[PDB]
């Protein structure tokens, strides 16, 4: 999820760069003013786009098998509190 | 489909050539006039003849298996639009 979120923010960054290059091609002689470059961050929209491709490799059936094994191991009952010395 | 269409146009071309050879055998001494040779192209009739032997190797069941795998991979739902920060 993090990889894909960074990846979508990354596409956003490169698209902004490509638009900047297009603008410079439009006005190559236009001196680049000291415009504060927008901070290239990882925003929530790209987290949304990443989770749109979120996966869950493990199903509840696999966890059911795991807890079945855990139960076959546990088998603990009876003397939890019924034991005390005279 | 393209191979068979070209192939049938190709049979047409060779049949025309064979008929020309037969005519020349009939009149070997007949000087070959400057008759514009018919343009040996790939026409729609031979595309019809080729598609008459068109195949589809993949059935809808194979694509159903592929999309079943794609669904087992996708498993994406729930938080497409239900998530937003305060």
JSON list of C-alpha atoms in Angstrom, two decimals:
[
{"chain": "A", "resi": 1, "resn": "UNK", "atom": "CA", "xyz": [0.00, 0.00, 0.00]},
{"chain": "A", "resi": 2, "resn": "UNK", "atom": "CA", "xyz": [2.84, 2.38, 0.84]},
{"chain": "A", "resi": 3, "resn": "UNK", "atom": "CA", "xyz": [4.70, 1.42, -2.33]},
{"chain": "A", "resi": 4, "resn": "UNK", "atom": "CA", "xyz": [1.66, 2.15, -4.49]},
{"chain": "A", "resi": 5, "resn": "UNK", "atom": "CA", "xyz": [0.85, 5.38, -2.65]},
{"chain": "A", "resi": 6, "resn": "UNK", "atom": "CA", "xyz": [4.39, 6.65, -3.16]},
{"chain": "A", "resi": 7, "resn": "UNK", "atom": "CA", "xyz": [4.14, 5.41, -6.75]},
{"chain": "A", "resi": 8, "resn": "UNK", "atom": "CA", "xyz": [1.01, 7.44, -7.47]},
{"chain": "A", "resi": 9, "resn": "UNK", "atom": "CA", "xyz": [2.42, 10.55, -5.79]},
{"chain": "A", "resi": 10, "resn": "UNK", "atom": "CA", "xyz": [5.45, 9.83, -7.97]},
{"chain": "A", "resi": 11, "resn": "UNK", "atom": "CA", "xyz": [3.39, 9.85, -11.16]},
{"chain": "A", "resi": 12, "resn": "UNK", "atom": "CA", "xyz": [1.94, 13.14, -9.94]},
{"chain": "A", "resi": 13, "resn": "UNK", "atom": "CA", "xyz": [5.44, 14.57, -9.48]},
{"chain": "A", "resi": 14, "resn": "UNK", "atom": "CA", "xyz": [6.61, 13.51, -12.92]},
{"chain": "A", "resi": 15, "resn": "UNK", "atom": "CA", "xyz": [3.42, 14.84, -14.52]},
{"chain": "A", "resi": 16, "resn": "UNK", "atom": "CA", "xyz": [4.06, 18.21, -12.88]},
{"chain": "A", "resi": 17, "resn": "UNK", "atom": "CA", "xyz": [7.65, 18.08, -14.15]},
{"chain": "A", "resi": 18, "resn": "UNK", "atom": "CA", "xyz": [6.48, 17.26, -17.68]},
{"chain": "A", "resi": 19, "resn": "UNK", "atom": "CA", "xyz": [4.01, 20.15, -17.60]},
{"chain": "A", "resi": 20, "resn": "UNK", "atom": "CA", "xyz": [6.82, 22.43, -16.44]},
{"chain": "A", "resi": 21, "resn": "UNK", "atom": "CA", "xyz": [8.99, 21.24, -19.33]},
{"chain": "A", "resi": 22, "resn": "UNK", "atom": "CA", "xyz": [6.10, 21.86, -21.74]},
{"chain": "A", "resi": 23, "resn": "UNK", "atom": "CA", "xyz": [5.68, 25.39, -20.38]},
{"chain": "A", "resi": 24, "resn": "UNK", "atom": "CA", "xyz": [9.41, 26.05, -20.73]},
{"chain": "A", "resi": 25, "resn": "UNK", "atom": "CA", "xyz": [9.25, 24.80, -24.33]},
{"chain": "A", "resi": 26, "resn": "UNK", "atom": "CA", "xyz": [6.40, 27.27, -24.85]},
{"chain": "A", "resi": 27, "resn": "UNK", "atom": "CA", "xyz": [8.48, 30.11, -23.34]},
{"chain": "A", "resi": 28, "resn": "UNK", "atom": "CA", "xyz": [12.14, 29.03, -23.40]},
{"chain": "A", "resi": 29, "resn": "UNK", "atom": "CA", "xyz": [13.38, 32.60, -22.97]},
{"chain": "A", "resi": 30, "resn": "UNK", "atom": "CA", "xyz": [11.06, 33.34, -20.03]},
{"chain": "A", "resi": 31, "resn": "UNK", "atom": "CA", "xyz": [13.44, 33.68, -17.09]},
{"chain": "A", "resi": 32, "resn": "UNK", "atom": "CA", "xyz": [12.48, 31.21, -14.37]},
{"chain": "A", "resi": 33, "resn": "UNK", "atom": "CA", "xyz": [11.14, 33.36, -11.54]},
{"chain": "A", "resi": 34, "resn": "UNK", "atom": "CA", "xyz": [11.83, 32.38, -7.95]},
{"chain": "A", "resi": 35, "resn": "UNK", "atom": "CA", "xyz": [8.46, 30.66, -7.66]},
{"chain": "A", "resi": 36, "resn": "UNK", "atom": "CA", "xyz": [8.47, 28.39, -4.61]},
{"chain": "A", "resi": 37, "resn": "UNK", "atom": "CA", "xyz": [8.32, 24.88, -6.03]},
{"chain": "A", "resi": 38, "resn": "UNK", "atom": "CA", "xyz": [5.30, 23.01, -4.70]},
{"chain": "A", "resi": 39, "resn": "UNK", "atom": "CA", "xyz": [6.45, 20.56, -2.04]},
{"chain": "A", "resi": 40, "resn": "UNK", "atom": "CA", "xyz": [6.49, 17.12, -3.69]},
{"chain": "A", "resi": 41, "resn": "UNK", "atom": "CA", "xyz": [4.83, 15.14, -0.90]},
{"chain": "A", "resi": 42, "resn": "UNK", "atom": "CA", "xyz": [2.78, 11.95, -0.64]},
{"chain": "A", "resi": 43, "resn": "UNK", "atom": "CA", "xyz": [-0.81, 13.10, -0.19]},
{"chain": "A", "resi": 44, "resn": "UNK", "atom": "CA", "xyz": [-3.99, 11.29, 0.83]},
{"chain": "A", "resi": 45, "resn": "UNK", "atom": "CA", "xyz": [-5.42, 11.15, -2.70]},
{"chain": "A", "resi": 46, "resn": "UNK", "atom": "CA", "xyz": [-2.59, 8.88, -3.82]},
{"chain": "A", "resi": 47, "resn": "UNK", "atom": "CA", "xyz": [-3.10, 6.75, -0.72]},
{"chain": "A", "resi": 48, "resn": "UNK", "atom": "CA", "xyz": [-6.69, 6.36, -1.91]},
{"chain": "A", "resi": 49, "resn": "UNK", "atom": "CA", "xyz": [-5.46, 5.44, -5.39]},
{"chain": "A", "resi": 50, "resn": "UNK", "atom": "CA", "xyz": [-3.04, 2.91, -3.91]},
{"chain": "A", "resi": 51, "resn": "UNK", "atom": "CA", "xyz": [-5.60, 1.23, -1.65]},
{"chain": "A", "resi": 52, "resn": "UNK", "atom": "CA", "xyz": [-7.86, 0.98, -4.69]},
{"chain": "A", "resi": 53, "resn": "UNK", "atom": "CA", "xyz": [-5.28, -1.70, -5.58]},
{"chain": "A", "resi": 54, "resn": "UNK", "atom": "CA", "xyz": [-4.91, -2.99, -2.01]},
{"chain": "A", "resi": 55, "resn": "UNK", "atom": "CA", "xyz": [-4.66, -6.76, -1.52]},
{"chain": "A", "resi": 56, "resn": "UNK", "atom": "CA", "xyz": [-5.21, -9.25, 1.29]},
{"chain": "A", "resi": 57, "resn": "UNK", "atom": "CA", "xyz": [-3.22, -12.38, 0.48]},
{"chain": "A", "resi": 58, "resn": "UNK", "atom": "CA", "xyz": [-4.53, -14.32, 3.50]},
{"chain": "A", "resi": 59, "resn": "UNK", "atom": "CA", "xyz": [-8.19, -15.31, 3.75]},
{"chain": "A", "resi": 60, "resn": "UNK", "atom": "CA", "xyz": [-10.17, -16.07, 6.89]},
{"chain": "A", "resi": 61, "resn": "UNK", "atom": "CA", "xyz": [-9.98, -19.77, 5.95]},
{"chain": "A", "resi": 62, "resn": "UNK", "atom": "CA", "xyz": [-6.20, -19.81, 6.29]},
{"chain": "A", "resi": 63, "resn": "UNK", "atom": "CA", "xyz": [-6.46, -18.11, 9.68]},
{"chain": "A", "resi": 64, "resn": "UNK", "atom": "CA", "xyz": [-9.15, -20.65, 10.56]},
{"chain": "A", "resi": 65, "resn": "UNK", "atom": "CA", "xyz": [-6.67, -23.42, 9.77]},
{"chain": "A", "resi": 66, "resn": "UNK", "atom": "CA", "xyz": [-4.01, -21.67, 11.85]},
{"chain": "A", "resi": 67, "resn": "UNK", "atom": "CA", "xyz": [-6.34, -21.32, 14.84]},
{"chain": "A", "resi": 68, "resn": "UNK", "atom": "CA", "xyz": [-7.39, -24.95, 14.41]},
{"chain": "A", "resi": 69, "resn": "UNK", "atom": "CA", "xyz": [-3.72, -25.87, 14.78]},
{"chain": "A", "resi": 70, "resn": "UNK", "atom": "CA", "xyz": [-3.49, -23.50, 17.75]},
{"chain": "A", "resi": 71, "resn": "UNK", "atom": "CA", "xyz": [-6.49, -25.24, 19.34]},
{"chain": "A", "resi": 72, "resn": "UNK", "atom": "CA", "xyz": [-5.04, -28.70, 18.71]},
{"chain": "A", "resi": 73, "resn": "UNK", "atom": "CA", "xyz": [-2.00, -27.35, 20.54]},
{"chain": "A", "resi": 74, "resn": "UNK", "atom": "CA", "xyz": [-3.76, -25.50, 23.37]},
{"chain": "A", "resi": 75, "resn": "UNK", "atom": "CA", "xyz": [-6.05, -28.17, 24.87]},
{"chain": "A", "resi": 76, "resn": "UNK", "atom": "CA", "xyz": [-5.85, -26.33, 28.21]},
{"chain": "A", "resi": 77, "resn": "UNK", "atom": "CA", "xyz": [-8.82, -26.45, 30.59]},
{"chain": "A", "resi": 78, "resn": "UNK", "atom": "CA", "xyz": [-10.11, -27.97, 33.81]},
{"chain": "A", "resi": 79, "resn": "UNK", "atom": "CA", "xyz": [-7.50, -27.04, 36.42]},
{"chain": "A", "resi": 80, "resn": "UNK", "atom": "CA", "xyz": [-7.21, -23.31, 35.76]},
{"chain": "A", "resi": 81, "resn": "UNK", "atom": "CA", "xyz": [-8.67, -22.50, 39.17]},
{"chain": "A", "resi": 82, "resn": "UNK", "atom": "CA", "xyz": [-10.00, -25.79, 40.60]},
{"chain": "A", "resi": 83, "resn": "UNK", "atom": "CA", "xyz": [-6.66, -26.70, 42.23]},
{"chain": "A", "resi": 84, "resn": "UNK", "atom": "CA", "xyz": [-5.66, -25.51, 45.70]},
{"chain": "A", "resi": 85, "resn": "UNK", "atom": "CA", "xyz": [-3.77, -27.14, 48.56]},
{"chain": "A", "resi": 86, "resn": "UNK", "atom": "CA", "xyz": [-5.29, -27.78, 51.97]},
{"chain": "B", "resi": 1, "resn": "UNK", "atom": "CA", "xyz": [-6.64, -14.75, -40.86]},
{"chain": "B", "resi": 2, "resn": "UNK", "atom": "CA", "xyz": [-4.23, -12.49, -42.71]},
{"chain": "B", "resi": 3, "resn": "UNK", "atom": "CA", "xyz": [-2.06, -15.44, -43.70]},
{"chain": "B", "resi": 4, "resn": "UNK", "atom": "CA", "xyz": [-5.03, -17.31, -45.15]},
{"chain": "B", "resi": 5, "resn": "UNK", "atom": "CA", "xyz": [-6.41, -14.22, -46.89]},
{"chain": "B", "resi": 6, "resn": "UNK", "atom": "CA", "xyz": [-3.06, -13.57, -48.55]},
{"chain": "B", "resi": 7, "resn": "UNK", "atom": "CA", "xyz": [-2.90, -17.30, -49.31]},
{"chain": "B", "resi": 8, "resn": "UNK", "atom": "CA", "xyz": [-6.23, -17.30, -51.14]},
{"chain": "B", "resi": 9, "resn": "UNK", "atom": "CA", "xyz": [-5.39, -14.12, -53.06]},
{"chain": "B", "resi": 10, "resn": "UNK", "atom": "CA", "xyz": [-2.16, -15.97, -53.83]},
{"chain": "B", "resi": 11, "resn": "UNK", "atom": "CA", "xyz": [-3.99, -18.94, -55.30]},
{"chain": "B", "resi": 12, "resn": "UNK", "atom": "CA", "xyz": [-5.97, -16.43, -57.35]},
{"chain": "B", "resi": 13, "resn": "UNK", "atom": "CA", "xyz": [-2.75, -14.88, -58.65]},
{"chain": "B", "resi": 14, "resn": "UNK", "atom": "CA", "xyz": [-1.22, -18.21, -59.62]},
{"chain": "B", "resi": 15, "resn": "UNK", "atom": "CA", "xyz": [-4.46, -19.32, -61.29]},
{"chain": "B", "resi": 16, "resn": "UNK", "atom": "CA", "xyz": [-4.41, -16.15, -63.38]},
{"chain": "B", "resi": 17, "resn": "UNK", "atom": "CA", "xyz": [-0.76, -16.84, -64.24]},
{"chain": "B", "resi": 18, "resn": "UNK", "atom": "CA", "xyz": [-1.59, -20.42, -65.25]},
{"chain": "B", "resi": 19, "resn": "UNK", "atom": "CA", "xyz": [-4.44, -19.22, -67.45]},
{"chain": "B", "resi": 20, "resn": "UNK", "atom": "CA", "xyz": [-2.06, -16.72, -69.05]},
{"chain": "B", "resi": 21, "resn": "UNK", "atom": "CA", "xyz": [0.43, -19.52, -69.72]},
{"chain": "B", "resi": 22, "resn": "UNK", "atom": "CA", "xyz": [-2.36, -21.64, -71.23]},
{"chain": "B", "resi": 23, "resn": "UNK", "atom": "CA", "xyz": [-3.36, -18.76, -73.50]},
{"chain": "B", "resi": 24, "resn": "UNK", "atom": "CA", "xyz": [0.25, -18.26, -74.58]},
{"chain": "B", "resi": 25, "resn": "UNK", "atom": "CA", "xyz": [0.50, -21.98, -75.34]},
{"chain": "B", "resi": 26, "resn": "UNK", "atom": "CA", "xyz": [-2.63, -21.56, -77.46]},
{"chain": "B", "resi": 27, "resn": "UNK", "atom": "CA", "xyz": [-1.08, -18.58, -79.30]},
{"chain": "B", "resi": 28, "resn": "UNK", "atom": "CA", "xyz": [2.69, -18.71, -78.74]},
{"chain": "B", "resi": 29, "resn": "UNK", "atom": "CA", "xyz": [3.38, -16.39, -81.68]},
{"chain": "B", "resi": 30, "resn": "UNK", "atom": "CA", "xyz": [0.80, -13.80, -80.59]},
{"chain": "B", "resi": 31, "resn": "UNK", "atom": "CA", "xyz": [2.92, -10.81, -79.59]},
{"chain": "B", "resi": 32, "resn": "UNK", "atom": "CA", "xyz": [2.15, -9.84, -75.99]},
{"chain": "B", "resi": 33, "resn": "UNK", "atom": "CA", "xyz": [0.34, -6.51, -76.27]},
{"chain": "B", "resi": 34, "resn": "UNK", "atom": "CA", "xyz": [0.94, -3.84, -73.64]},
{"chain": "B", "resi": 35, "resn": "UNK", "atom": "CA", "xyz": [-2.17, -4.88, -71.73]},
{"chain": "B", "resi": 36, "resn": "UNK", "atom": "CA", "xyz": [-2.03, -3.40, -68.23]},
{"chain": "B", "resi": 37, "resn": "UNK", "atom": "CA", "xyz": [-1.59, -6.40, -65.94]},
{"chain": "B", "resi": 38, "resn": "UNK", "atom": "CA", "xyz": [-4.39, -6.58, -63.39]},
{"chain": "B", "resi": 39, "resn": "UNK", "atom": "CA", "xyz": [-3.07, -5.38, -60.04]},
{"chain": "B", "resi": 40, "resn": "UNK", "atom": "CA", "xyz": [-2.44, -8.51, -57.95]},
{"chain": "B", "resi": 41, "resn": "UNK", "atom": "CA", "xyz": [-3.97, -7.33, -54.68]},
{"chain": "B", "resi": 42, "resn": "UNK", "atom": "CA", "xyz": [-5.56, -8.96, -51.64]},
{"chain": "B", "resi": 43, "resn": "UNK", "atom": "CA", "xyz": [-9.30, -8.46, -52.07]},
{"chain": "B", "resi": 44, "resn": "UNK", "atom": "CA", "xyz": [-12.24, -8.89, -49.71]},
{"chain": "B", "resi": 45, "resn": "UNK", "atom": "CA", "xyz": [-13.41, -12.17, -51.28]},
{"chain": "B", "resi": 46, "resn": "UNK", "atom": "CA", "xyz": [-10.23, -13.91, -50.17]},
{"chain": "B", "resi": 47, "resn": "UNK", "atom": "CA", "xyz": [-10.62, -12.38, -46.71]},
{"chain": "B", "resi": 48, "resn": "UNK", "atom": "CA", "xyz": [-14.04, -14.05, -46.67]},
{"chain": "B", "resi": 49, "resn": "UNK", "atom": "CA", "xyz": [-12.47, -17.34, -47.77]},
{"chain": "B", "resi": 50, "resn": "UNK", "atom": "CA", "xyz": [-9.81, -17.03, -45.07]},
{"chain": "B", "resi": 51, "resn": "UNK", "atom": "CA", "xyz": [-12.25, -16.26, -42.25]},
{"chain": "B", "resi": 52, "resn": "UNK", "atom": "CA", "xyz": [-14.25, -19.28, -43.39]},
{"chain": "B", "resi": 53, "resn": "UNK", "atom": "CA", "xyz": [-11.26, -21.05, -41.80]},
{"chain": "B", "resi": 54, "resn": "UNK", "atom": "CA", "xyz": [-10.94, -18.60, -38.89]},
{"chain": "B", "resi": 55, "resn": "UNK", "atom": "CA", "xyz": [-10.19, -20.04, -35.45]},
{"chain": "B", "resi": 56, "resn": "UNK", "atom": "CA", "xyz": [-10.55, -18.94, -31.83]},
{"chain": "B", "resi": 57, "resn": "UNK", "atom": "CA", "xyz": [-8.09, -20.96, -29.75]},
{"chain": "B", "resi": 58, "resn": "UNK", "atom": "CA", "xyz": [-9.30, -19.50, -26.43]},
{"chain": "B", "resi": 59, "resn": "UNK", "atom": "CA", "xyz": [-12.79, -20.26, -25.12]},
{"chain": "B", "resi": 60, "resn": "UNK", "atom": "CA", "xyz": [-14.83, -18.20, -22.69]},
{"chain": "B", "resi": 61, "resn": "UNK", "atom": "CA", "xyz": [-14.07, -20.83, -20.03]},
{"chain": "B", "resi": 62, "resn": "UNK", "atom": "CA", "xyz": [-10.34, -20.08, -20.16]},
{"chain": "B", "resi": 63, "resn": "UNK", "atom": "CA", "xyz": [-11.06, -16.36, -19.85]},
{"chain": "B", "resi": 64, "resn": "UNK", "atom": "CA", "xyz": [-13.41, -17.22, -16.99]},
{"chain": "B", "resi": 65, "resn": "UNK", "atom": "CA", "xyz": [-10.52, -18.97, -15.25]},
{"chain": "B", "resi": 66, "resn": "UNK", "atom": "CA", "xyz": [-8.27, -15.97, -15.92]},
{"chain": "B", "resi": 67, "resn": "UNK", "atom": "CA", "xyz": [-10.81, -13.53, -14.47]},
{"chain": "B", "resi": 68, "resn": "UNK", "atom": "CA", "xyz": [-11.30, -15.86, -11.50]},
{"chain": "B", "resi": 69, "resn": "UNK", "atom": "CA", "xyz": [-7.57, -15.53, -10.86]},
{"chain": "B", "resi": 70, "resn": "UNK", "atom": "CA", "xyz": [-7.87, -11.78, -11.38]},
{"chain": "B", "resi": 71, "resn": "UNK", "atom": "CA", "xyz": [-10.68, -11.67, -8.81]},
{"chain": "B", "resi": 72, "resn": "UNK", "atom": "CA", "xyz": [-8.72, -13.75, -6.31]},
{"chain": "B", "resi": 73, "resn": "UNK", "atom": "CA", "xyz": [-6.02, -11.12, -6.80]},
{"chain": "B", "resi": 74, "resn": "UNK", "atom": "CA", "xyz": [-8.21, -8.00, -6.76]},
{"chain": "B", "resi": 75, "resn": "UNK", "atom": "CA", "xyz": [-10.18, -8.35, -3.51]},
{"chain": "B", "resi": 76, "resn": "UNK", "atom": "CA", "xyz": [-10.46, -4.53, -3.39]},
{"chain": "B", "resi": 77, "resn": "UNK", "atom": "CA", "xyz": [-13.53, -2.94, -1.79]},
{"chain": "B", "resi": 78, "resn": "UNK", "atom": "CA", "xyz": [-14.79, -1.11, 1.27]},
{"chain": "B", "resi": 79, "resn": "UNK", "atom": "CA", "xyz": [-12.50, 1.92, 1.58]},
{"chain": "B", "resi": 80, "resn": "UNK", "atom": "CA", "xyz": [-12.70, 3.26, -1.97]},
{"chain": "B", "resi": 81, "resn": "UNK", "atom": "CA", "xyz": [-14.48, 6.41, -0.78]},
{"chain": "B", "resi": 82, "resn": "UNK", "atom": "CA", "xyz": [-15.41, 5.81, 2.88]},
{"chain": "B", "resi": 83, "resn": "UNK", "atom": "CA", "xyz": [-12.09, 7.18, 4.19]},
{"chain": "B", "resi": 84, "resn": "UNK", "atom": "CA", "xyz": [-11.50, 10.88, 4.86]},
{"chain": "B", "resi": 85, "resn": "UNK", "atom": "CA", "xyz": [-9.58, 12.74, 7.55]},
{"chain": "B", "resi": 86, "resn": "UNK", "atom": "CA", "xyz": [-11.20, 15.15, 9.99]}
]
